[PDB]
Amino acid sequence: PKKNGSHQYELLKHAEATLGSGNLRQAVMLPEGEDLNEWIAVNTVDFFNQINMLYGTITEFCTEASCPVMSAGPRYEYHWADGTNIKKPIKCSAPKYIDYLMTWVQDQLDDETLFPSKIGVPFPKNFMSVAKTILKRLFRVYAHIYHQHFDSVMQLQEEAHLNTSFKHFIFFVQEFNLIDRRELAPLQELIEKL
Amino acid sequence: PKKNGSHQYELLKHAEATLGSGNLRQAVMLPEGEDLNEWIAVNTVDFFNQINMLYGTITEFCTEASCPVMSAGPRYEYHWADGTNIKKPIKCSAPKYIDYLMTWVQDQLDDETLFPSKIGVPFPKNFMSVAKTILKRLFRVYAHIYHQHFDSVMQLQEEAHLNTSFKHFIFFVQEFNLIDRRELAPLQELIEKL
Amino acid sequence: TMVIN
Amino acid sequence: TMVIN
Ligand SMILES: [Zn+2]
Ligand SMILES: [Zn+2]
């Protein structure tokens, strides 16, 4: 239920289709003559949508009860802070943190000084920084689902859905240098097998 | 530029992600416990969007001049008729025919007795017939681009975009028996290699 | 709707 | 924002 769009819409469909080759390191690369900021912006939006729906499938198993903290494994714990509303990181539940996190990413996506909808308006000079912060924070949603909820992911059959979207995610951030090794440490074991 | 949706939206993202395995005969299959009509409806919409954007990239090379007829090769020629507005097939240009064709598919997509947006409303009993007619008619847009315009498809670099989307298209209609061999005859040589 | 040579 | 044990 949606349909015809341009020009970043062809880019999104371009990226979605080219994954069908199964070689994700090639289909992740910047198409010839395409704006780097727009290619990352287009995929960052799609990643946000994908992980929003992946987490939405398991949302009944992630509660204030079974997830009092944001966790990827026992070793890693996330406390939420952004710019101003919350400066010092605050300890909260995994459902509430992801709500903070996804509502925050939406706010950047709806900021036209950041993600301009007019096709002729340059992305800001700091756009690369803003996109790195988005993707590094969305990765943590993969990490929490994999460590805590993977059993629910297999009760539903989303495991192919999640692993294909996660493989696409890692190969994309790796191609463009979008996330530090220190941030991918929780899934590092899975990352090395992919 | 779009974002959060349910439940057929997860289905669309589900299908888009699972292609990343490169095995398209598996990711095309009906997920366990999913409504067959809804799984075909969700992919039919995505196919429509994909081929709408693929044809939109070459739209400057397809004119009343170089394409006075709808053609897949010299052997195959299409004349447009639907239900009522045009009953007897009429000879027109390839741009005008595809405009007739895509505007027609949109009209079915916007018909809620056919593609209901409410998640609890059954698809009509004839839905399978309506979807077969859509996909068999959208295939012809692949066929015209491949035969006539493939040189333009490679001047732009859309050839991976088109071949991956076409491979996904053929494997999907083949899985669900959505198109007769007689209709795929123009691309049959390419279909046999895929 | 579909003619062949 | 990110704490490790
Ligand atoms: Zn949880
Ligand atoms: Zn043409």
Give me the CATH number covering residue A50.
1.20.140.30
Structure tokens at B124: 């009509």
Residues 6+ apart with CB under 8 A from A94: A62, A67, A68, A69, A70, A71, A144, A148
Interface of D with A in 1-5 (CB under 8 A): 1-5
Residues 6+ apart with CB under 8 A from A26: A18
Sheet holding B70-72, edge to edge: B70-72, B76-78, C2-4
Residues 6+ apart with CB under 8 A from B106: A3, A4, B48
Q: How far apart are CA A117 and CA A133, in angstroms?
A: 20
Q: Please state the three-class secondary structure of chain A as a single string.
A: CCCCCCCHHHHHHHHHHHHHHCCHHHHCCCCCCCCHHHHHHHHHHHHHHHHHHHHHHCCCCCCCCCCCCEEECCCEEECECCCCCCCCCECCCHHHHHHHHHHHHHHHHCCCCCCCCCCCCCCCCCHHHHHHHHHHHHHHHHHHHHHCCHHHHHHCCCHHHHHHHHHHHHHHHHHHCCCCHHHHHHHHHHHHHC
Structure tokens at A52: 């929003």
DSSP category for residue B70: E
Q: State the residue for tokens 């463009």.
A: A176
| Secondary structure element (H or E) that encloses residue B11, with its range | helix B8-18
User: At how many Å resolution was this determined?
Assistant: 2.5
Are residues A4 and B161, on separate chains, in Cβ contact within 8 Å? no
A21 in Cβ contact with A30 (< 8 Å): no
Residue of A nearest to B110 (CA): A1
Q: Which of B58, B52, B67, B61 is nearest to B156 (CA)?
A: B58
B103 in Cβ contact with B97 (< 8 Å): no
User: Which ligand has an atom closest to residue A59 CA?
Assistant: 1
State which residues form the domain around B120: 1-194
- A22 phi-psi bin (left φ>0, alpha ψ -120 to 50, beta other): left
Are residues B10 and A49, on separate chains, in Cβ contact within 8 Å? no
CA angle B14, B30, A27 (to 5 degrees): 40
Q: How far apart are CA A162 and CA A142, in angstroms?
A: 8
Residue B52, SS3 per DSSP: helix
Taking the centre of ligand 1 as the mean of its atom positions, its distance from the CA of residue A183, in whole angstroms, is 19
What is the least distance, in Å, from the CA of B81 to any CA of chain C? 6
Method: X-ray
Q: Please state the three-class secondary structure of B74-132 as a single string.
A: CCEEECECCCCCCCCCECCCHHHHHHHHHHHHHHHHCCCCCCCCCCCCCCCCCHHHHHH
Q: How far apart are CA A157 and CA A57, in angstroms?
A: 10
Q: How far is CA A65 from the centre of its chain?
A: 25
Residue type, A122: P
Q: How many domains does the structure of chain A reveal? A: 1
